[PDB]
Amino acid sequence: MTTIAFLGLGNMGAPMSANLVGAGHVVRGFDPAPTAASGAAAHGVAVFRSAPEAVAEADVVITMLPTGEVVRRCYTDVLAAARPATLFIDSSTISVTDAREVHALAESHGMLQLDAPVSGGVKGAAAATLAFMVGGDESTLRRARPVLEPMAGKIIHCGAAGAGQAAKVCNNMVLAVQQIAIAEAFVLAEKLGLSAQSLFDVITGATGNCWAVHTNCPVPGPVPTSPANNDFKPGFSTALMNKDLGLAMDAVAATGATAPLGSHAADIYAKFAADHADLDFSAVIHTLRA
Amino acid sequence: TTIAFLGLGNMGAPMSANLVGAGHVVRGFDPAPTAASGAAAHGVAVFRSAPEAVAEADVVITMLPTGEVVRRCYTDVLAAARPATLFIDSSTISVTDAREVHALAESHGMLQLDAPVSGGVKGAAAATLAFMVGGDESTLRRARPVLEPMAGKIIHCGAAGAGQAAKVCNNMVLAVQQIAIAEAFVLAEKLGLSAQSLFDVITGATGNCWAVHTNCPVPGPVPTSPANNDFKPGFSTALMNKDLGLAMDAVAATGATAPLGSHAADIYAKFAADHADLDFSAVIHTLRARA
Ligand SMILES: NC(=O)c1ccc[n+]([C@@H]2O[C@H](COP(=O)([O-])OP(=O)(O)OC[C@H]3O[C@@H](n4cnc5c(N)ncnc54)[C@H](O)[C@@H]3O)[C@@H](O)[C@H]2O)c1
Ligand SMILES: NC(=O)c1ccc[n+]([C@@H]2O[C@H](COP(=O)([O-])OP(=O)(O)OC[C@H]3O[C@@H](n4cnc5c(N)ncnc54)[C@H](O)[C@@H]3O)[C@@H](O)[C@H]2O)c1
Ligand SMILES: C[C@@H](CCC(=O)O)C(=O)O
Ligand SMILES: C[C@@H](CCC(=O)O)C(=O)O
Ligand SMILES: C[C@@H](CCC(=O)O)C(=O)O
C-alpha cells in the first residue's frame, strides 16, 4: 500500500483511480476539470487544489492525460514538486517521440519513469481488466507492478522507454487496417449475393479471422454484442482511433517508415472522424455503401 | 463412384491420387504429358481427350487455371456426359464465370457446384484442403463422399458462386492483413521495439491474425514461418496476385468500394513482377519501392 498521486481523472482516470482506492492505496488526485475531480472524490480520491500539491507526498505519480503536450506541461509543472526518486507512470497515449522526451525529463529531475499506455477502454478500466504495455527498465516495472495490478488484466513489458507507446500504436494501426478490410469484404459479399452470416462463418474459420470480425463484426447479426447491433455506439470511438492513427502517422514520419496501408487507413479515418467521431470505428463500413 | 478429373496439375494430381486411394475409379485428362503420366502412375486411367474421360463418369471435377478454360472445358464435355452427372469445379475463378458455368451445366441436366479450395499442394497431398462450396444443399450432400477424401473442411457458402465469393473475400482481407503486419514489424524495428516484443503484444491483442501468428514475416518468433526459410511458399505471391486479380474483377463487376483491398492488389501485382515465387509474406521487403 503506497501513496499514489493521480493526475487526470477523466473517463479513464476516474475508474482507474477508484480501483486503486478499492485496493487500499491512498490516492491524491488532481484534475483542473472540477466535474472530474468531484466524481473521483466521491469514490475516495483525496482531491488537491494543484498538481504540485498532489504529487508532494506521493511514492507514485500516475498521469492519464489527453495528449503529449499536456503530459509535457504537467511534467514541467510537477517534477520539481515531487520527492526525489518518485516513480512516474504515464498511462496516456502519446507519441513515441513525446514519451521519450518526457521520460528523459523525468529522469533528469531524479524520478523513475515508465510509459504504460493501455487498452480496454472505460469498461476495461472499471473492471480492472486493462492491458498495460510498458516501456522502461525492468527493475522500475518490478517496483510498479503492485500499483498496476489492481487496475490490470495484463501487464506486458515491451522494451525500453517509449516501447509501450510503440507497441500500442503498431497494434492499433494494424487494427484500423483490419477493420476497414473487414468492412470492405462484407460490402463486396453483399453485392456478390453472399450472405453476411456465410462470409462471417468463412472468414472466422479461415486465415482472415481477427477481432475486427469475430468481436467487432460491422454488420448486424452474426455477433449480436458488436456495435453494429447497437447503432454503432462505441465501443472504440472513431475519435479515439483517429487519435491513435495520428500518433502512428507521427511515428511513421519520425522514423521515415513506409506504411502504405496504415497511412491509407489514417486518411480514411481522418475523413470519417470529421462527421462520425462519436460512432464506433467499425462504422466506417458506412462509407463503402451508397 | 467413377470420377473424371480434368486438370492433373499441381493441385489436380494429388487430389486425384486421394480419390484413387479412397476407392474411386478415376478417369483423367490433361494436355501436359508429364501431368497425365504422373497421374497414371498413381492409378488414374488417362484418356486422350476430355470428352472421352467424361463419358462413363458419375462425377466430373475440374481443376483448371482460369474461368475461360473452365468455360471451354464445359462446352467441350457437356454433351459427352450422362444425364444428372455431378460437375464440381474446384478451380479458382470469378464469381461471374462460376455462375455462368453453373447455369450452363444445369441447362444440360447436370448438377453443379463451385468448390474452390484453400491449402496448397501440401494440403492437397495431405487431404486437408478446405472446400468453400456454392450450390444446392442437396447437391453438396451427394458430393460429400467424393469431397471428403480430399478435404479437412467442407463449408456450404450459399447458392452457385458463393464458394468463389467467400474465398475471394477472405483472401482479399488476408492480403491486406499480410501487408499491414509487415508495415507494423518494420515500424516497430525503426522505433526500437524488438520483433519478439511486437509479436508478443500483437498476438495477445486486437491486431492478432494468421498473418502474424503463423506467417510472421520476420525470422525468430514463429520458427516455421516462411521468413525463417528464405520465404519458400507457403502461399506464393504468384497465387496471391491471381486471387487479388479476381477480387478486383468482383469489385469492378459490382461497382464496390474497396480501397485497401485494391491498394493491396496494386502492391502485390508489382511485387509479383519481381518475386512471384516467394511466399506472399516477403512483401515486407518491398515496402520501400512504395516510399
Ligand atoms: N477513453 C478511452 O476509451 C481510452 C482507451 C485507451 C486509452 N485512452 C487514452 O487515455 C488518455 C486519457 O483518456 P480519457 O478518455 O480519460 O480522456 P479525458 O479527456 O476524459 O480525461 C483526461 C482528463 O485530464 C484532465 N487534465 C488535463 N490537463 C491536466 C493536468 N495538467 N493535470 C491533471 N489533469 C489534467 C482533463 O481535465 C480530463 O479530465 C488519453 O491519452 C487517451 O488516448 C483512452
Ligand atoms: N497451386 C496452389 O497452391 C493452389 C491452391 C488453391 C487453388 N489453386 C487453384 O487451382 C487451380 C489449378 O491450379 P494448379 O496449381 O493445379 O495449376 P496447374 O497449372 O499446375 O494445373 C492445371 C492443369 O490443367 C491442365 N489443363 C489445361 N486445360 C485443360 C483442359 N481443358 N482439360 C484438362 N486439363 C487442362 C494444364 O495442363 C495443367 O496441368 C487454379 O485455379 C488455382 O488458382 C491452386
Ligand atoms: C487478453 C488477456 C486478458 C487480460 C486483460 O484484460 O488485459 C488474457 O487472455 O489474459
Ligand atoms: C494484471 C495483473 C492481475 C491483477 C488483476 O487481476 O487485477 C497481473 O497479475 O499481471
Ligand atoms: C471433410 C470431412 C472429413 C472427411 C475426410 O477427410 O475423411 C469433415 O471434416 O467433415
XYZ file of C-alpha atoms and ligand atoms in Angstrom:
699
model
C 0.000 0.000 0.000
C 1.610 3.161 -1.235
C 0.532 6.751 -1.708
C -0.323 7.476 -5.353
C -0.864 10.820 -6.966
C -3.229 10.585 -9.914
C -3.236 13.419 -12.403
C -6.044 13.140 -14.934
C -9.314 11.858 -13.524
C -11.386 11.698 -16.666
C -13.092 8.861 -18.498
C -10.209 6.559 -17.873
C -8.512 8.103 -14.836
C -11.705 8.156 -12.707
C -12.356 4.396 -12.788
C -8.599 3.627 -12.650
C -8.263 5.746 -9.513
C -11.318 4.161 -7.959
C -9.753 0.713 -8.272
C -6.590 1.970 -6.601
C -8.668 3.353 -3.662
C -10.543 -0.006 -3.503
C -7.227 -1.858 -3.234
C -6.253 0.202 -0.149
C -3.963 2.825 -1.722
C -4.146 6.425 -0.577
C -4.849 8.305 -3.844
C -4.076 12.025 -4.105
C -5.909 13.341 -7.178
C -5.784 16.439 -9.262
C -7.734 17.379 -12.368
C -8.407 21.012 -13.462
C -11.960 19.992 -14.576
C -13.883 20.211 -11.294
C -16.516 17.783 -12.565
C -13.844 15.105 -12.977
C -12.322 15.845 -9.603
C -15.715 15.767 -7.878
C -16.544 12.298 -9.292
C -13.151 10.988 -8.209
C -13.601 12.414 -4.700
C -16.968 10.560 -4.462
C -15.070 7.295 -4.821
C -12.425 8.163 -2.171
C -9.693 10.044 -4.011
C -8.352 12.942 -1.922
C -8.563 15.861 -4.300
C -5.995 18.691 -4.160
C -6.021 22.288 -5.297
C -2.992 21.855 -7.585
C -0.960 19.126 -9.218
C 2.172 20.144 -7.330
C 0.380 19.735 -4.126
C -0.986 16.304 -5.073
C 2.499 14.996 -6.022
C 4.319 16.480 -2.990
C 3.956 13.451 -0.755
C 3.404 10.615 -3.276
C 5.515 7.441 -3.769
C 4.000 7.110 -7.276
C 2.563 9.585 -9.733
C 0.245 8.383 -12.477
C -0.753 10.580 -15.425
C -3.809 9.774 -17.564
C -3.906 12.760 -19.868
C -5.189 13.716 -23.329
C -2.019 14.495 -25.291
C 1.712 14.502 -25.353
C 1.691 18.299 -24.988
C -0.474 18.122 -21.882
C 1.867 15.418 -20.437
C 4.913 17.602 -21.170
C 3.341 20.630 -19.487
C 2.176 18.566 -16.471
C 5.710 17.141 -16.005
C 7.247 20.606 -16.293
C 4.814 21.826 -13.647
C 5.161 18.969 -11.150
C 8.536 17.206 -11.373
C 10.345 19.656 -9.018
C 7.473 19.310 -6.525
C 7.848 15.558 -6.212
C 10.161 13.762 -3.751
C 13.408 12.512 -5.273
C 13.131 9.043 -6.724
C 9.349 9.109 -7.003
C 8.017 6.668 -9.659
C 6.138 8.421 -12.545
C 3.892 6.237 -14.695
C 2.384 7.846 -17.791
C -0.637 5.792 -18.975
C -1.675 8.422 -21.563
C -1.490 7.553 -25.215
C 1.107 9.832 -26.706
C 3.725 9.731 -29.470
C 6.870 7.646 -29.087
C 8.887 10.849 -29.548
C 6.901 12.678 -26.823
C 7.169 9.641 -24.487
C 10.967 9.556 -24.893
C 11.188 13.282 -24.255
C 9.073 13.155 -21.064
C 10.896 10.113 -19.820
C 14.234 11.903 -20.138
C 12.741 14.968 -18.483
C 11.533 12.909 -15.511
C 14.903 11.228 -15.153
C 16.831 14.496 -15.348
C 14.752 15.512 -12.323
C 15.766 12.332 -10.435
C 12.476 10.468 -10.961
C 11.870 6.945 -12.185
C 9.544 6.815 -15.159
C 7.581 4.347 -17.279
C 5.324 4.633 -20.266
C 2.358 2.346 -19.650
C -0.413 3.104 -22.093
C -3.412 0.876 -22.013
C -6.088 -0.882 -23.976
C -9.601 -1.824 -22.858
C -11.463 1.478 -22.743
C -13.702 2.649 -19.963
C -15.279 -0.782 -19.454
C -11.892 -2.317 -19.076
C -10.875 0.469 -16.740
C -13.862 -0.028 -14.461
C -13.488 -3.815 -14.384
C -9.705 -3.583 -13.783
C -9.046 -5.684 -16.943
C -6.911 -3.154 -18.834
C -3.861 -4.190 -20.714
C -0.732 -2.156 -19.766
C 2.018 -2.079 -22.414
C 5.114 -0.859 -20.565
C 8.294 0.761 -21.665
C 11.231 1.360 -19.354
C 13.564 -0.520 -17.040
C 12.682 -3.978 -15.826
C 13.528 -3.069 -12.238
C 11.249 0.005 -12.341
C 8.416 -2.204 -13.680
C 9.120 -4.564 -10.768
C 8.613 -1.578 -8.423
C 5.441 -0.514 -10.304
C 3.783 -3.911 -10.520
C 1.876 -3.779 -7.226
C 0.332 -0.425 -8.329
C -0.536 -1.606 -11.842
C -2.087 -4.913 -10.677
C -5.321 -3.576 -9.175
C -6.027 -1.832 -12.493
C -4.918 -4.555 -14.894
C -5.823 -7.751 -16.527
C -2.434 -7.926 -18.355
C 0.965 -6.187 -17.870
C 3.473 -6.683 -20.663
C 6.968 -5.331 -20.721
C 7.628 -4.097 -24.261
C 11.197 -2.774 -24.043
C 12.985 0.483 -23.127
C 11.284 3.835 -22.645
C 8.777 4.501 -25.404
C 8.266 0.797 -26.310
C 4.899 0.696 -24.643
C 3.657 3.536 -26.777
C 5.318 1.924 -29.794
C 3.676 -1.463 -29.273
C 0.264 0.091 -28.778
C 0.485 2.311 -31.847
C 1.697 -0.607 -34.030
C -1.156 -2.823 -32.875
C -3.708 -0.087 -33.376
C -2.548 0.754 -36.900
C -2.980 -2.928 -37.803
C -6.411 -2.895 -36.141
C -7.573 0.090 -38.180
C -6.425 -1.548 -41.415
C -8.245 -4.798 -40.440
C -11.470 -3.028 -39.507
C -11.664 -1.289 -42.884
C -10.670 -4.527 -44.749
C -13.334 -6.497 -42.967
C -15.831 -3.801 -43.805
C -14.799 -3.918 -47.492
C -15.259 -7.702 -47.526
C -18.781 -7.581 -46.033
C -19.939 -4.949 -48.520
C -18.385 -6.825 -51.505
C -20.082 -10.023 -50.239
C -23.429 -8.252 -50.102
C -23.035 -7.033 -53.681
C -21.993 -10.520 -54.855
C -25.067 -12.026 -53.122
C -23.013 -13.851 -50.438
C -24.817 -13.612 -47.073
C -23.217 -11.830 -44.148
C -23.630 -14.880 -41.940
C -21.965 -17.018 -44.619
C -18.981 -14.644 -45.047
C -18.645 -14.429 -41.244
C -18.564 -18.189 -40.863
C -15.954 -18.495 -43.601
C -13.547 -15.774 -42.593
C -13.705 -16.609 -38.901
C -12.859 -20.268 -39.703
C -10.122 -19.244 -42.162
C -6.906 -17.200 -42.408
C -8.644 -13.858 -42.425
C -10.030 -14.156 -38.918
C -9.344 -11.266 -36.497
C -11.028 -9.291 -33.749
C -12.432 -6.776 -36.228
C -14.702 -9.541 -37.468
C -15.043 -12.035 -34.656
C -15.767 -9.482 -31.975
C -16.417 -6.162 -33.838
C -18.405 -7.547 -36.818
C -19.500 -4.453 -38.680
C -22.886 -5.856 -39.918
C -25.682 -6.652 -37.536
C -26.496 -10.271 -36.871
C -23.536 -12.601 -36.676
C -22.089 -11.145 -33.429
C -25.058 -9.725 -31.545
C -22.774 -7.999 -28.997
C -20.875 -5.994 -31.690
C -21.591 -2.207 -32.057
C -23.317 -2.744 -35.428
C -26.200 -4.147 -33.432
C -26.392 -1.074 -31.119
C -26.414 1.800 -33.595
C -22.641 1.767 -33.728
C -22.358 3.141 -30.193
C -18.719 2.894 -29.012
C -17.073 0.522 -28.226
C -13.864 2.168 -29.540
C -14.831 5.520 -30.956
C -13.775 6.831 -34.335
C -12.453 9.897 -32.490
C -10.081 7.715 -30.459
C -8.997 5.584 -33.442
C -8.320 8.776 -35.389
C -6.146 9.966 -32.494
C -4.194 6.705 -32.375
C -3.718 6.743 -36.144
C -2.415 10.302 -35.972
C 0.114 9.003 -33.449
C 1.020 6.154 -35.836
C 1.498 8.681 -38.630
C 3.773 10.698 -36.249
C 5.807 7.552 -35.692
C 5.964 6.875 -39.463
C 7.071 10.448 -40.081
C 9.638 10.374 -37.244
C 11.212 7.102 -38.473
C 10.884 7.542 -42.241
C 8.963 4.194 -42.308
C 6.808 3.236 -45.203
C 3.349 2.167 -44.151
C 1.134 2.386 -47.260
C -1.999 0.700 -45.916
C -1.591 2.133 -42.385
C -1.293 5.669 -43.934
C -4.300 4.944 -46.204
C -6.271 3.823 -43.216
C -5.254 7.002 -41.388
C -6.585 9.079 -44.308
C -9.875 7.131 -44.295
C -10.386 7.513 -40.550
C -9.440 11.209 -40.584
C -12.235 11.897 -43.070
C -14.673 9.667 -41.347
C -13.885 11.393 -37.981
C -14.909 14.820 -39.442
C -18.595 13.769 -39.217
C -18.764 10.469 -37.299
C -16.301 10.916 -34.420
C -18.884 9.739 -31.970
C -19.529 6.330 -33.737
C -17.662 3.118 -33.113
C -14.734 2.915 -35.580
C -16.433 -0.170 -37.180
C -18.979 2.358 -38.578
C -16.504 3.155 -41.305
C -18.457 0.476 -43.280
C -20.983 3.298 -43.984
C -18.542 4.968 -46.275
C -18.360 1.891 -48.571
C -22.106 1.881 -49.350
C -24.473 4.251 -51.272
C -18.232 -43.813 -57.979
C -16.473 -43.178 -61.329
C -14.874 -39.744 -61.384
C -13.487 -37.867 -64.388
C -10.709 -35.442 -63.281
C -9.882 -32.761 -65.770
C -6.693 -30.858 -64.833
C -3.983 -33.030 -63.258
C -1.526 -30.312 -62.393
C -0.037 -29.205 -59.127
C -3.352 -29.466 -57.300
C -5.226 -31.937 -59.527
C -2.536 -34.653 -59.365
C -2.524 -35.110 -55.501
C -6.293 -34.628 -55.324
C -6.888 -37.360 -57.819
C -4.453 -39.665 -56.034
C -6.524 -39.262 -52.845
C -9.635 -40.223 -54.812
C -7.936 -43.362 -56.104
C -6.783 -44.074 -52.529
C -10.367 -43.868 -51.272
C -11.659 -46.451 -53.734
C -12.934 -44.403 -56.638
C -12.419 -45.209 -60.285
C -10.693 -42.114 -61.607
C -10.557 -41.220 -65.277
C -8.277 -38.368 -66.222
C -7.352 -35.874 -68.863
C -4.606 -33.284 -69.028
C -2.938 -31.913 -72.194
C 0.503 -31.865 -70.485
C 2.053 -35.353 -70.825
C 4.167 -35.061 -67.710
C 0.904 -34.323 -65.721
C -1.028 -37.145 -67.330
C 1.893 -39.686 -66.836
C 2.352 -38.688 -63.230
C -1.416 -39.198 -62.729
C -1.462 -42.652 -64.479
C 1.373 -43.659 -62.182
C -0.956 -43.255 -59.193
C -3.883 -45.139 -60.699
C -5.729 -42.655 -62.871
C -6.817 -44.047 -66.175
C -5.814 -41.263 -68.605
C -7.681 -40.604 -71.859
C -6.647 -38.723 -74.941
C -9.457 -36.228 -74.740
C -11.657 -34.557 -72.128
C -14.952 -35.836 -73.609
C -13.541 -39.389 -73.510
C -12.719 -39.119 -69.815
C -16.180 -37.783 -69.020
C -18.112 -40.441 -70.986
C -18.534 -43.034 -68.193
C -18.249 -40.654 -65.207
C -20.758 -40.111 -62.392
C -18.781 -37.006 -61.258
C -16.664 -34.606 -63.213
C -14.089 -32.484 -61.355
C -12.260 -29.626 -62.951
C -9.106 -28.167 -61.509
C -8.083 -25.702 -64.174
C -6.203 -22.409 -64.471
C -8.906 -19.885 -65.337
C -12.617 -19.271 -65.920
C -12.063 -19.118 -69.625
C -10.533 -22.631 -69.601
C -13.284 -23.928 -67.337
C -15.922 -22.488 -69.668
C -14.352 -24.052 -72.772
C -13.904 -27.411 -70.991
C -17.632 -27.421 -70.067
C -18.793 -26.738 -73.586
C -16.218 -29.330 -74.717
C -17.611 -32.088 -72.431
C -21.172 -31.440 -71.502
C -22.707 -33.312 -74.491
C -20.493 -36.307 -73.676
C -21.616 -36.612 -70.030
C -24.555 -38.741 -68.902
C -27.696 -37.039 -67.536
C -27.540 -35.919 -63.927
C -23.737 -36.199 -63.811
C -22.409 -34.125 -60.924
C -19.911 -31.419 -62.040
C -17.707 -29.931 -59.376
C -15.430 -27.002 -60.302
C -12.615 -26.625 -57.776
C -10.740 -24.076 -59.906
C -10.360 -20.569 -58.510
C -12.342 -18.408 -60.947
C -14.531 -15.291 -60.897
C -17.967 -15.337 -59.328
C -19.364 -14.293 -62.709
C -17.675 -17.159 -64.557
C -18.674 -19.579 -61.820
C -22.351 -18.651 -62.143
C -22.225 -18.847 -65.881
C -20.693 -22.320 -65.980
C -23.141 -23.476 -63.277
C -26.136 -22.362 -65.358
C -24.595 -23.975 -68.448
C -24.166 -27.303 -66.715
C -27.641 -27.238 -65.168
C -29.250 -26.422 -68.569
C -27.791 -29.792 -69.755
C -29.479 -31.613 -66.940
C -26.309 -31.823 -64.814
C -25.904 -30.956 -61.121
C -23.118 -28.460 -60.481
C -21.123 -26.994 -57.620
C -18.330 -24.452 -57.296
C -15.911 -25.848 -54.702
C -12.722 -23.850 -54.799
C -10.042 -24.695 -52.232
C -7.512 -23.376 -49.766
C -4.419 -25.246 -48.532
C -1.947 -25.567 -51.425
C -0.124 -28.597 -52.739
C 0.764 -29.691 -49.161
C -2.902 -29.587 -48.241
C -3.834 -31.337 -51.454
C -1.393 -34.176 -50.826
C -2.294 -34.464 -47.144
C -6.078 -34.371 -47.965
C -6.629 -31.343 -45.675
C -7.997 -28.905 -48.195
C -10.783 -26.507 -47.197
C -13.554 -26.565 -49.823
C -15.808 -23.489 -49.993
C -18.962 -24.617 -51.789
C -21.667 -22.887 -53.719
C -24.776 -24.574 -54.958
C -27.766 -26.540 -53.728
C -27.580 -28.217 -50.346
C -28.909 -31.494 -51.771
C -26.178 -31.472 -54.475
C -23.478 -30.839 -51.829
C -24.869 -33.829 -49.820
C -24.470 -36.040 -52.923
C -20.948 -34.707 -53.462
C -19.818 -35.065 -49.866
C -18.375 -38.582 -50.146
C -16.292 -37.541 -53.097
C -15.018 -34.382 -51.432
C -14.322 -35.979 -48.048
C -11.210 -37.935 -49.098
C -9.667 -34.732 -50.442
C -10.782 -32.479 -47.570
C -10.100 -31.283 -43.996
C -13.070 -28.893 -44.187
C -16.180 -28.559 -46.400
C -18.260 -25.382 -46.000
C -21.520 -24.582 -47.727
C -21.332 -20.884 -48.586
C -24.632 -20.390 -50.345
C -26.058 -20.647 -53.864
C -23.877 -21.096 -57.036
C -20.932 -18.739 -56.986
C -20.867 -18.332 -53.154
C -17.812 -20.558 -52.744
C -15.764 -18.432 -55.124
C -17.117 -15.269 -53.441
C -16.234 -16.482 -49.962
C -12.701 -17.470 -50.965
C -12.088 -14.169 -52.851
C -13.353 -12.106 -49.884
C -11.251 -13.993 -47.309
C -8.172 -13.752 -49.453
C -8.549 -10.002 -50.146
C -8.636 -9.495 -46.318
C -5.627 -11.834 -45.906
C -3.570 -9.841 -48.401
C -4.368 -6.568 -46.604
C -3.502 -8.207 -43.244
C -0.173 -9.615 -44.507
C 0.920 -6.206 -45.730
C -0.375 -4.465 -42.563
C 1.623 -6.911 -40.343
C 4.716 -6.261 -42.417
C 4.322 -2.499 -42.012
C 3.928 -2.950 -38.275
C 7.133 -5.048 -37.946
C 9.190 -2.572 -39.936
C 7.775 0.425 -37.990
C 8.483 -1.405 -34.707
C 12.050 -2.028 -35.768
C 12.605 1.634 -36.642
C 11.093 2.653 -33.300
C 13.483 0.275 -31.439
C 10.757 -2.218 -30.443
C 12.105 -5.703 -30.890
C 10.305 -8.145 -33.238
C 9.727 -10.613 -30.411
C 8.206 -7.825 -28.306
C 5.838 -6.661 -31.030
C 4.914 -10.308 -31.746
C 4.147 -10.914 -28.050
C 1.915 -7.846 -27.874
C 0.039 -8.153 -31.168
C -0.622 -11.876 -30.756
C -2.170 -11.098 -27.321
C -4.142 -8.087 -28.620
C -6.804 -6.939 -31.101
C -4.404 -6.959 -34.084
C -3.807 -10.729 -33.934
C -4.293 -12.745 -37.133
C -2.761 -15.693 -39.002
C -0.521 -13.339 -40.964
C 1.390 -12.751 -37.746
C 0.750 -15.802 -35.506
C 1.612 -18.328 -38.215
C 3.040 -16.368 -41.143
C 5.164 -13.882 -39.166
C 7.284 -12.057 -41.795
C 10.377 -11.633 -39.632
C 12.525 -14.563 -38.596
C 12.504 -15.802 -34.946
C 9.102 -15.545 -33.369
C 7.436 -18.349 -35.341
C 10.292 -20.698 -36.359
C 8.174 -22.435 -39.026
C 7.136 -19.224 -40.845
C 8.483 -18.696 -44.386
C 10.693 -15.819 -43.172
C 12.915 -18.404 -41.466
C 13.275 -20.464 -44.707
C 14.172 -17.915 -47.439
C 10.464 -17.172 -47.917
C 9.695 -20.538 -49.601
C 5.987 -20.862 -50.046
C 3.787 -21.430 -48.163
C 1.405 -19.369 -50.266
C 3.169 -17.829 -53.293
C 2.953 -14.174 -54.352
C 2.014 -15.525 -57.786
C -1.117 -17.153 -56.362
C -1.921 -14.242 -54.063
C -1.673 -11.907 -57.099
C -4.001 -14.222 -59.011
C -6.612 -14.174 -56.245
C -6.476 -10.433 -55.829
C -6.956 -10.070 -59.610
C -10.204 -11.998 -59.111
C -11.105 -9.796 -56.207
C -10.590 -6.703 -58.433
C -12.863 -8.366 -61.060
C -15.529 -8.807 -58.489
C -15.080 -5.174 -57.305
C -15.337 -3.883 -60.924
C -18.312 -6.116 -61.759
C -20.298 -4.963 -58.668
C -19.033 -1.393 -58.521
C -17.939 -1.954 -54.917
C -15.735 0.398 -52.948
C -12.636 -1.448 -51.701
C -9.829 0.950 -51.132
C -7.480 -1.106 -49.024
C -8.123 -4.341 -50.927
C -7.467 -2.505 -54.199
C -4.338 -0.980 -52.746
C -3.132 -4.427 -51.641
C -3.876 -5.743 -55.148
C -1.724 -2.930 -56.611
C 1.070 -3.789 -54.165
C 1.033 -7.497 -54.839
C 0.802 -7.068 -58.703
C 4.002 -5.023 -58.585
C 5.700 -7.399 -56.113
C 4.774 -10.381 -58.390
C 6.830 -8.813 -61.215
C 9.933 -9.497 -59.159
C 9.282 -12.143 -56.580
C 6.374 -14.248 -57.765
C 7.938 -17.461 -56.400
C 8.325 -16.186 -52.805
C 5.775 -16.562 -50.131
C 3.483 -13.566 -50.028
C 4.789 -12.597 -46.583
C 8.013 -11.483 -48.403
C 6.112 -8.289 -49.275
C 7.728 -6.931 -46.081
C 10.875 -6.384 -48.163
C 9.212 -4.364 -50.977
C 7.683 -1.590 -48.947
C 10.479 0.868 -49.813
C 9.545 0.510 -53.522
C 6.334 2.306 -52.234
C 8.337 5.222 -50.485
N -11.267 6.648 -23.297
C -10.775 5.520 -23.790
O -11.545 4.639 -24.208
C -9.293 5.287 -23.872
C -8.819 3.955 -24.087
C -7.440 3.740 -24.084
C -6.582 4.835 -23.878
N -7.069 6.136 -23.771
C -6.153 7.271 -23.574
O -6.144 7.655 -22.180
C -5.886 9.075 -22.080
C -6.991 9.750 -21.277
O -8.250 9.428 -21.897
P -9.596 9.860 -21.184
O -10.613 9.164 -22.035
O -9.557 9.582 -19.712
O -9.622 11.453 -21.523
P -10.473 12.558 -20.717
O -10.325 13.781 -21.590
O -11.751 12.000 -20.308
O -9.638 12.806 -19.420
C -8.417 13.495 -19.334
C -8.527 14.342 -18.078
O -7.278 15.015 -17.941
C -7.537 16.244 -17.318
N -6.317 17.102 -17.377
C -5.890 17.912 -18.401
N -4.734 18.536 -18.036
C -4.425 18.082 -16.784
C -3.324 18.261 -15.834
N -2.289 19.071 -16.083
N -3.342 17.632 -14.650
C -4.358 16.826 -14.363
N -5.377 16.575 -15.171
C -5.451 17.175 -16.383
C -8.767 16.745 -18.018
O -9.339 17.778 -17.234
C -9.611 15.459 -18.157
O -10.474 15.304 -17.032
C -5.778 9.587 -23.494
O -4.393 9.783 -23.818
C -6.458 8.521 -24.330
O -5.930 8.416 -25.661
C -8.399 6.346 -23.738
N -1.358 -24.305 -56.570
C -1.967 -23.986 -55.442
O -1.380 -23.935 -54.434
C -3.439 -23.701 -55.433
C -4.157 -23.552 -54.253
C -5.507 -23.291 -54.325
C -6.105 -23.193 -55.554
N -5.410 -23.296 -56.654
C -6.141 -23.190 -57.914
O -6.281 -24.412 -58.548
C -6.376 -24.309 -59.934
C -5.281 -25.160 -60.559
O -4.032 -24.884 -60.017
P -2.727 -25.714 -60.237
O -1.837 -25.214 -59.289
O -3.026 -27.093 -60.198
O -2.271 -25.263 -61.670
P -1.527 -26.153 -62.732
O -1.241 -25.309 -63.840
O -0.472 -26.808 -62.119
O -2.539 -27.241 -63.199
C -3.536 -27.029 -64.163
C -3.575 -28.121 -65.214
O -4.667 -28.040 -66.073
C -4.300 -28.523 -67.327
N -5.333 -28.161 -68.318
C -5.477 -27.050 -69.032
N -6.563 -27.113 -69.805
C -7.135 -28.273 -69.581
C -8.338 -28.972 -70.033
N -9.149 -28.415 -70.926
N -8.552 -30.191 -69.539
C -7.742 -30.727 -68.644
N -6.686 -30.146 -68.165
C -6.328 -28.955 -68.598
C -2.889 -27.994 -67.512
O -2.169 -28.727 -68.447
C -2.336 -28.157 -66.110
O -1.657 -29.381 -65.894
C -6.226 -22.819 -60.229
O -7.467 -22.245 -60.479
C -5.571 -22.272 -58.969
O -5.914 -20.951 -58.662
C -4.130 -23.538 -56.621
C -6.390 -10.866 -23.128
C -5.977 -11.206 -21.673
C -6.941 -10.679 -20.610
C -6.276 -9.742 -19.604
C -6.575 -8.277 -19.948
O -7.758 -7.892 -19.846
O -5.679 -7.464 -20.337
C -5.723 -12.667 -21.317
O -6.056 -13.612 -22.055
O -5.155 -12.869 -20.220
C -2.749 -7.839 -14.407
C -2.435 -8.369 -13.006
C -3.663 -9.088 -12.445
C -4.301 -8.230 -11.351
C -5.815 -8.167 -11.569
O -6.375 -9.212 -11.966
O -6.377 -7.075 -11.334
C -1.261 -9.347 -13.081
O -1.213 -10.244 -12.213
O -0.437 -9.174 -14.005
C -14.337 -33.127 -44.767
C -14.794 -34.128 -43.705
C -13.663 -35.116 -43.414
C -13.686 -36.239 -44.454
C -12.283 -36.830 -44.597
O -11.353 -36.032 -44.847
O -12.170 -38.067 -44.455
C -15.160 -33.378 -42.422
O -14.231 -32.796 -41.821
O -16.360 -33.406 -42.072
